[PDB]
């Protein structure tokens, strides 16, 4: 039921997902376009991620662009899902094809709370330079995220 599972997750339909999880399904089964339910999950539904991770969903999977779900969470400012990902051993220092950590993405987009949690409560490598030589703080400054910059240098 890989397709149905992925579909329910993508739609943020917890009810449908949970009923579908009553079957003997492989939560890591790819859908119509090679993506797992966790990968296409509609962010802002941390319980959907939890239920999937609980059943053994692999959080570190990457798409063609080398993007993992935690990358999307951090980039769009969805803290709860990002934390859920971490409580289930997701690699916080996973890099996309450009060498960016979730920290770079959260910093670049100005998501202060996410950056705060990553810098103070995770193993995020704050000094990690991407392939172009930029650290998360560098990108924050480049994009004018002055509050993120202050926060990062404050404690780091």
mmCIF file with all atom_site columns, C-alpha atoms in Angstrom:
data_model
loop_
_atom_site.group_PDB
_atom_site.id
_atom_site.type_symbol
_atom_site.label_atom_id
_atom_site.label_alt_id
_atom_site.label_comp_id
_atom_site.label_asym_id
_atom_site.label_entity_id
_atom_site.label_seq_id
_atom_site.pdbx_PDB_ins_code
_atom_site.Cartn_x
_atom_site.Cartn_y
_atom_site.Cartn_z
_atom_site.occupancy
_atom_site.B_iso_or_equiv
_atom_site.pdbx_formal_charge
_atom_site.auth_seq_id
_atom_site.auth_comp_id
_atom_site.auth_asym_id
_atom_site.auth_atom_id
_atom_site.pdbx_PDB_model_num
ATOM 1   C CA . UNK A 1 1   ? 0.000  0.000  0.000  1.00 0.00 ? 1   UNK A CA 1
ATOM 2   C CA . UNK A 1 2   ? 3.013  2.229  -0.595 1.00 0.00 ? 2   UNK A CA 1
ATOM 3   C CA . UNK A 1 3   ? 1.152  4.562  -2.937 1.00 0.00 ? 3   UNK A CA 1
ATOM 4   C CA . UNK A 1 4   ? -1.904 4.918  -0.693 1.00 0.00 ? 4   UNK A CA 1
ATOM 5   C CA . UNK A 1 5   ? 0.332  5.449  2.355  1.00 0.00 ? 5   UNK A CA 1
ATOM 6   C CA . UNK A 1 6   ? 2.393  8.106  0.582  1.00 0.00 ? 6   UNK A CA 1
ATOM 7   C CA . UNK A 1 7   ? -0.792 9.748  -0.665 1.00 0.00 ? 7   UNK A CA 1
ATOM 8   C CA . UNK A 1 8   ? -2.326 9.931  2.798  1.00 0.00 ? 8   UNK A CA 1
ATOM 9   C CA . UNK A 1 9   ? 0.899  11.415 4.156  1.00 0.00 ? 9   UNK A CA 1
ATOM 10  C CA . UNK A 1 10  ? 1.214  13.922 1.310  1.00 0.00 ? 10  UNK A CA 1
ATOM 11  C CA . UNK A 1 11  ? -2.344 15.105 2.017  1.00 0.00 ? 11  UNK A CA 1
ATOM 12  C CA . UNK A 1 12  ? -1.774 15.430 5.741  1.00 0.00 ? 12  UNK A CA 1
ATOM 13  C CA . UNK A 1 13  ? -4.600 12.945 6.334  1.00 0.00 ? 13  UNK A CA 1
ATOM 14  C CA . UNK A 1 14  ? -3.620 11.371 9.667  1.00 0.00 ? 14  UNK A CA 1
ATOM 15  C CA . UNK A 1 15  ? -6.875 9.396  9.930  1.00 0.00 ? 15  UNK A CA 1
ATOM 16  C CA . UNK A 1 16  ? -6.387 7.748  6.565  1.00 0.00 ? 16  UNK A CA 1
ATOM 17  C CA . UNK A 1 17  ? -2.709 7.085  7.309  1.00 0.00 ? 17  UNK A CA 1
ATOM 18  C CA . UNK A 1 18  ? -3.456 5.378  10.635 1.00 0.00 ? 18  UNK A CA 1
ATOM 19  C CA . UNK A 1 19  ? -6.157 3.164  9.116  1.00 0.00 ? 19  UNK A CA 1
ATOM 20  C CA . UNK A 1 20  ? -3.769 2.240  6.303  1.00 0.00 ? 20  UNK A CA 1
ATOM 21  C CA . UNK A 1 21  ? -1.101 1.441  8.914  1.00 0.00 ? 21  UNK A CA 1
ATOM 22  C CA . UNK A 1 22  ? -3.346 -1.367 10.151 1.00 0.00 ? 22  UNK A CA 1
ATOM 23  C CA . UNK A 1 23  ? -2.290 -3.336 7.078  1.00 0.00 ? 23  UNK A CA 1
ATOM 24  C CA . UNK A 1 24  ? 1.042  -5.127 6.809  1.00 0.00 ? 24  UNK A CA 1
ATOM 25  C CA . UNK A 1 25  ? 2.742  -2.335 4.895  1.00 0.00 ? 25  UNK A CA 1
ATOM 26  C CA . UNK A 1 26  ? 6.356  -1.322 4.336  1.00 0.00 ? 26  UNK A CA 1
ATOM 27  C CA . UNK A 1 27  ? 6.504  2.337  5.356  1.00 0.00 ? 27  UNK A CA 1
ATOM 28  C CA . UNK A 1 28  ? 9.689  2.626  3.307  1.00 0.00 ? 28  UNK A CA 1
ATOM 29  C CA . UNK A 1 29  ? 7.988  1.589  0.064  1.00 0.00 ? 29  UNK A CA 1
ATOM 30  C CA . UNK A 1 30  ? 8.388  4.123  -2.749 1.00 0.00 ? 30  UNK A CA 1
ATOM 31  C CA . UNK A 1 31  ? 5.391  5.638  -4.540 1.00 0.00 ? 31  UNK A CA 1
ATOM 32  C CA . UNK A 1 32  ? 4.630  6.473  -8.166 1.00 0.00 ? 32  UNK A CA 1
ATOM 33  C CA . UNK A 1 33  ? 7.757  8.616  -8.437 1.00 0.00 ? 33  UNK A CA 1
ATOM 34  C CA . UNK A 1 34  ? 10.229 6.867  -6.142 1.00 0.00 ? 34  UNK A CA 1
ATOM 35  C CA . UNK A 1 35  ? 9.397  8.746  -2.943 1.00 0.00 ? 35  UNK A CA 1
ATOM 36  C CA . UNK A 1 36  ? 8.415  7.367  0.458  1.00 0.00 ? 36  UNK A CA 1
ATOM 37  C CA . UNK A 1 37  ? 5.457  8.515  2.523  1.00 0.00 ? 37  UNK A CA 1
ATOM 38  C CA . UNK A 1 38  ? 7.818  10.287 4.889  1.00 0.00 ? 38  UNK A CA 1
ATOM 39  C CA . UNK A 1 39  ? 9.452  12.119 1.973  1.00 0.00 ? 39  UNK A CA 1
ATOM 40  C CA . UNK A 1 40  ? 6.202  13.434 0.474  1.00 0.00 ? 40  UNK A CA 1
ATOM 41  C CA . UNK A 1 41  ? 4.564  13.977 3.850  1.00 0.00 ? 41  UNK A CA 1
ATOM 42  C CA . UNK A 1 42  ? 2.803  17.333 4.127  1.00 0.00 ? 42  UNK A CA 1
ATOM 43  C CA . UNK A 1 43  ? 4.846  19.282 6.685  1.00 0.00 ? 43  UNK A CA 1
ATOM 44  C CA . UNK A 1 44  ? 3.112  20.603 9.781  1.00 0.00 ? 44  UNK A CA 1
ATOM 45  C CA . UNK A 1 45  ? 1.836  17.150 10.717 1.00 0.00 ? 45  UNK A CA 1
ATOM 46  C CA . UNK A 1 46  ? 4.410  15.889 13.260 1.00 0.00 ? 46  UNK A CA 1
ATOM 47  C CA . UNK A 1 47  ? 2.101  13.030 14.279 1.00 0.00 ? 47  UNK A CA 1
ATOM 48  C CA . UNK A 1 48  ? 2.152  11.713 10.707 1.00 0.00 ? 48  UNK A CA 1
ATOM 49  C CA . UNK A 1 49  ? 5.950  11.658 10.816 1.00 0.00 ? 49  UNK A CA 1
ATOM 50  C CA . UNK A 1 50  ? 5.942  10.089 14.270 1.00 0.00 ? 50  UNK A CA 1
ATOM 51  C CA . UNK A 1 51  ? 3.614  7.294  13.237 1.00 0.00 ? 51  UNK A CA 1
ATOM 52  C CA . UNK A 1 52  ? 5.788  6.647  10.171 1.00 0.00 ? 52  UNK A CA 1
ATOM 53  C CA . UNK A 1 53  ? 9.058  6.739  12.109 1.00 0.00 ? 53  UNK A CA 1
ATOM 54  C CA . UNK A 1 54  ? 7.503  4.501  14.761 1.00 0.00 ? 54  UNK A CA 1
ATOM 55  C CA . UNK A 1 55  ? 6.966  1.868  12.049 1.00 0.00 ? 55  UNK A CA 1
ATOM 56  C CA . UNK A 1 56  ? 10.574 2.124  10.941 1.00 0.00 ? 56  UNK A CA 1
ATOM 57  C CA . UNK A 1 57  ? 10.511 4.855  8.279  1.00 0.00 ? 57  UNK A CA 1
ATOM 58  C CA . UNK A 1 58  ? 14.064 5.715  7.219  1.00 0.00 ? 58  UNK A CA 1
ATOM 59  C CA . UNK A 1 59  ? 14.505 9.465  7.795  1.00 0.00 ? 59  UNK A CA 1
ATOM 60  C CA . UNK A 1 60  ? 17.837 9.883  5.986  1.00 0.00 ? 60  UNK A CA 1
ATOM 61  C CA . UNK A 1 61  ? 16.556 9.055  2.494  1.00 0.00 ? 61  UNK A CA 1
ATOM 62  C CA . UNK A 1 62  ? 17.484 11.621 -0.156 1.00 0.00 ? 62  UNK A CA 1
ATOM 63  C CA . UNK A 1 63  ? 15.823 12.616 -3.420 1.00 0.00 ? 63  UNK A CA 1
ATOM 64  C CA . UNK A 1 64  ? 17.701 13.368 -6.654 1.00 0.00 ? 64  UNK A CA 1
ATOM 65  C CA . UNK A 1 65  ? 18.678 16.814 -5.388 1.00 0.00 ? 65  UNK A CA 1
ATOM 66  C CA . UNK A 1 66  ? 20.120 15.112 -2.315 1.00 0.00 ? 66  UNK A CA 1
ATOM 67  C CA . UNK A 1 67  ? 17.428 16.536 -0.118 1.00 0.00 ? 67  UNK A CA 1
ATOM 68  C CA . UNK A 1 68  ? 16.191 14.749 2.999  1.00 0.00 ? 68  UNK A CA 1
ATOM 69  C CA . UNK A 1 69  ? 12.939 15.486 4.821  1.00 0.00 ? 69  UNK A CA 1
ATOM 70  C CA . UNK A 1 70  ? 14.794 17.278 7.602  1.00 0.00 ? 70  UNK A CA 1
ATOM 71  C CA . UNK A 1 71  ? 16.124 19.619 4.933  1.00 0.00 ? 71  UNK A CA 1
ATOM 72  C CA . UNK A 1 72  ? 12.581 20.529 3.901  1.00 0.00 ? 72  UNK A CA 1
ATOM 73  C CA . UNK A 1 73  ? 11.456 20.923 7.521  1.00 0.00 ? 73  UNK A CA 1
ATOM 74  C CA . UNK A 1 74  ? 14.350 23.233 8.384  1.00 0.00 ? 74  UNK A CA 1
ATOM 75  C CA . UNK A 1 75  ? 13.971 25.197 5.155  1.00 0.00 ? 75  UNK A CA 1
ATOM 76  C CA . UNK A 1 76  ? 10.243 25.826 5.681  1.00 0.00 ? 76  UNK A CA 1
ATOM 77  C CA . UNK A 1 77  ? 10.462 26.449 9.426  1.00 0.00 ? 77  UNK A CA 1
ATOM 78  C CA . UNK A 1 78  ? 8.532  23.370 10.640 1.00 0.00 ? 78  UNK A CA 1
ATOM 79  C CA . UNK A 1 79  ? 10.246 22.854 13.984 1.00 0.00 ? 79  UNK A CA 1
ATOM 80  C CA . UNK A 1 80  ? 7.974  20.165 15.448 1.00 0.00 ? 80  UNK A CA 1
ATOM 81  C CA . UNK A 1 81  ? 8.491  17.776 12.539 1.00 0.00 ? 81  UNK A CA 1
ATOM 82  C CA . UNK A 1 82  ? 12.220 18.523 12.564 1.00 0.00 ? 82  UNK A CA 1
ATOM 83  C CA . UNK A 1 83  ? 12.407 17.606 16.257 1.00 0.00 ? 83  UNK A CA 1
ATOM 84  C CA . UNK A 1 84  ? 10.310 14.484 15.687 1.00 0.00 ? 84  UNK A CA 1
ATOM 85  C CA . UNK A 1 85  ? 12.811 13.554 12.994 1.00 0.00 ? 85  UNK A CA 1
ATOM 86  C CA . UNK A 1 86  ? 15.652 13.974 15.476 1.00 0.00 ? 86  UNK A CA 1
ATOM 87  C CA . UNK A 1 87  ? 14.048 12.030 18.316 1.00 0.00 ? 87  UNK A CA 1
ATOM 88  C CA . UNK A 1 88  ? 14.169 9.102  15.893 1.00 0.00 ? 88  UNK A CA 1
ATOM 89  C CA . UNK A 1 89  ? 17.882 9.405  15.114 1.00 0.00 ? 89  UNK A CA 1
ATOM 90  C CA . UNK A 1 90  ? 17.634 11.419 11.908 1.00 0.00 ? 90  UNK A CA 1
ATOM 91  C CA . UNK A 1 91  ? 21.087 12.654 10.841 1.00 0.00 ? 91  UNK A CA 1
ATOM 92  C CA . UNK A 1 92  ? 21.113 16.350 11.730 1.00 0.00 ? 92  UNK A CA 1
ATOM 93  C CA . UNK A 1 93  ? 24.280 16.903 9.703  1.00 0.00 ? 93  UNK A CA 1
ATOM 94  C CA . UNK A 1 94  ? 22.952 15.420 6.464  1.00 0.00 ? 94  UNK A CA 1
ATOM 95  C CA . UNK A 1 95  ? 24.054 17.447 3.397  1.00 0.00 ? 95  UNK A CA 1
ATOM 96  C CA . UNK A 1 96  ? 22.243 18.177 0.146  1.00 0.00 ? 96  UNK A CA 1
ATOM 97  C CA . UNK A 1 97  ? 24.036 18.241 -3.214 1.00 0.00 ? 97  UNK A CA 1
ATOM 98  C CA . UNK A 1 98  ? 25.308 21.742 -2.459 1.00 0.00 ? 98  UNK A CA 1
ATOM 99  C CA . UNK A 1 99  ? 26.851 20.816 0.868  1.00 0.00 ? 99  UNK A CA 1
ATOM 100 C CA . UNK A 1 100 ? 24.178 22.555 2.902  1.00 0.00 ? 100 UNK A CA 1
ATOM 101 C CA . UNK A 1 101 ? 23.109 21.257 6.301  1.00 0.00 ? 101 UNK A CA 1
ATOM 102 C CA . UNK A 1 102 ? 19.572 21.760 7.575  1.00 0.00 ? 102 UNK A CA 1
ATOM 103 C CA . UNK A 1 103 ? 21.209 24.556 9.597  1.00 0.00 ? 103 UNK A CA 1
ATOM 104 C CA . UNK A 1 104 ? 22.144 26.402 6.395  1.00 0.00 ? 104 UNK A CA 1
ATOM 105 C CA . UNK A 1 105 ? 18.579 26.234 5.085  1.00 0.00 ? 105 UNK A CA 1
ATOM 106 C CA . UNK A 1 106 ? 16.902 27.347 8.309  1.00 0.00 ? 106 UNK A CA 1
ATOM 107 C CA . UNK A 1 107 ? 19.445 30.168 8.609  1.00 0.00 ? 107 UNK A CA 1
ATOM 108 C CA . UNK A 1 108 ? 19.027 31.238 4.984  1.00 0.00 ? 108 UNK A CA 1
ATOM 109 C CA . UNK A 1 109 ? 15.240 31.440 5.352  1.00 0.00 ? 109 UNK A CA 1
ATOM 110 C CA . UNK A 1 110 ? 15.347 33.364 8.632  1.00 0.00 ? 110 UNK A CA 1
ATOM 111 C CA . UNK A 1 111 ? 13.745 30.697 10.834 1.00 0.00 ? 111 UNK A CA 1
ATOM 112 C CA . UNK A 1 112 ? 15.134 31.922 14.143 1.00 0.00 ? 112 UNK A CA 1
ATOM 113 C CA . UNK A 1 113 ? 13.505 29.278 16.355 1.00 0.00 ? 113 UNK A CA 1
ATOM 114 C CA . UNK A 1 114 ? 14.766 26.417 14.209 1.00 0.00 ? 114 UNK A CA 1
ATOM 115 C CA . UNK A 1 115 ? 18.299 27.824 14.145 1.00 0.00 ? 115 UNK A CA 1
ATOM 116 C CA . UNK A 1 116 ? 18.150 28.290 17.911 1.00 0.00 ? 116 UNK A CA 1
ATOM 117 C CA . UNK A 1 117 ? 17.160 24.652 18.518 1.00 0.00 ? 117 UNK A CA 1
ATOM 118 C CA . UNK A 1 118 ? 19.758 23.361 16.066 1.00 0.00 ? 118 UNK A CA 1
ATOM 119 C CA . UNK A 1 119 ? 22.629 25.367 17.537 1.00 0.00 ? 119 UNK A CA 1
ATOM 120 C CA . UNK A 1 120 ? 21.790 24.811 21.195 1.00 0.00 ? 120 UNK A CA 1
ATOM 121 C CA . UNK A 1 121 ? 20.177 21.359 21.251 1.00 0.00 ? 121 UNK A CA 1
ATOM 122 C CA . UNK A 1 122 ? 21.620 19.329 18.374 1.00 0.00 ? 122 UNK A CA 1
ATOM 123 C CA . UNK A 1 123 ? 24.995 18.163 17.110 1.00 0.00 ? 123 UNK A CA 1
ATOM 124 C CA . UNK A 1 124 ? 24.728 20.530 14.115 1.00 0.00 ? 124 UNK A CA 1
ATOM 125 C CA . UNK A 1 125 ? 28.193 21.473 12.849 1.00 0.00 ? 125 UNK A CA 1
ATOM 126 C CA . UNK A 1 126 ? 27.897 25.257 13.060 1.00 0.00 ? 126 UNK A CA 1
ATOM 127 C CA . UNK A 1 127 ? 31.202 25.806 11.249 1.00 0.00 ? 127 UNK A CA 1
ATOM 128 C CA . UNK A 1 128 ? 30.384 23.550 8.290  1.00 0.00 ? 128 UNK A CA 1
ATOM 129 C CA . UNK A 1 129 ? 31.196 25.278 4.995  1.00 0.00 ? 129 UNK A CA 1
ATOM 130 C CA . UNK A 1 130 ? 29.070 24.297 1.995  1.00 0.00 ? 130 UNK A CA 1
ATOM 131 C CA . UNK A 1 131 ? 30.671 23.460 -1.372 1.00 0.00 ? 131 UNK A CA 1
ATOM 132 C CA . UNK A 1 132 ? 30.839 27.173 -2.134 1.00 0.00 ? 132 UNK A CA 1
ATOM 133 C CA . UNK A 1 133 ? 32.577 27.949 1.141  1.00 0.00 ? 133 UNK A CA 1
ATOM 134 C CA . UNK A 1 134 ? 29.625 29.379 3.101  1.00 0.00 ? 134 UNK A CA 1
ATOM 135 C CA . UNK A 1 135 ? 28.618 28.527 6.664  1.00 0.00 ? 135 UNK A CA 1
ATOM 136 C CA . UNK A 1 136 ? 25.004 28.760 7.827  1.00 0.00 ? 136 UNK A CA 1
ATOM 137 C CA . UNK A 1 137 ? 25.821 32.100 9.484  1.00 0.00 ? 137 UNK A CA 1
ATOM 138 C CA . UNK A 1 138 ? 27.361 33.300 6.224  1.00 0.00 ? 138 UNK A CA 1
ATOM 139 C CA . UNK A 1 139 ? 24.122 32.577 4.362  1.00 0.00 ? 139 UNK A CA 1
ATOM 140 C CA . UNK A 1 140 ? 22.050 34.202 7.084  1.00 0.00 ? 140 UNK A CA 1
ATOM 141 C CA . UNK A 1 141 ? 24.050 37.400 6.641  1.00 0.00 ? 141 UNK A CA 1
ATOM 142 C CA . UNK A 1 142 ? 23.962 37.136 2.870  1.00 0.00 ? 142 UNK A CA 1
ATOM 143 C CA . UNK A 1 143 ? 20.177 36.984 2.974  1.00 0.00 ? 143 UNK A CA 1
ATOM 144 C CA . UNK A 1 144 ? 19.810 39.769 5.519  1.00 0.00 ? 144 UNK A CA 1
ATOM 145 C CA . UNK A 1 145 ? 18.648 37.543 8.386  1.00 0.00 ? 145 UNK A CA 1
ATOM 146 C CA . UNK A 1 146 ? 20.239 39.859 10.953 1.00 0.00 ? 146 UNK A CA 1
ATOM 147 C CA . UNK A 1 147 ? 18.428 38.325 13.953 1.00 0.00 ? 147 UNK A CA 1
ATOM 148 C CA . UNK A 1 148 ? 19.617 34.850 12.978 1.00 0.00 ? 148 UNK A CA 1
ATOM 149 C CA . UNK A 1 149 ? 23.143 36.224 12.580 1.00 0.00 ? 149 UNK A CA 1
ATOM 150 C CA . UNK A 1 150 ? 23.111 37.837 16.038 1.00 0.00 ? 150 UNK A CA 1
ATOM 151 C CA . UNK A 1 151 ? 21.774 34.612 17.567 1.00 0.00 ? 151 UNK A CA 1
ATOM 152 C CA . UNK A 1 152 ? 24.413 32.440 15.923 1.00 0.00 ? 152 UNK A CA 1
ATOM 153 C CA . UNK A 1 153 ? 27.380 34.589 16.888 1.00 0.00 ? 153 UNK A CA 1
ATOM 154 C CA . UNK A 1 154 ? 25.858 35.143 20.326 1.00 0.00 ? 154 UNK A CA 1
ATOM 155 C CA . UNK A 1 155 ? 26.311 31.491 21.147 1.00 0.00 ? 155 UNK A CA 1
ATOM 156 C CA . UNK A 1 156 ? 28.718 30.301 18.479 1.00 0.00 ? 156 UNK A CA 1
#
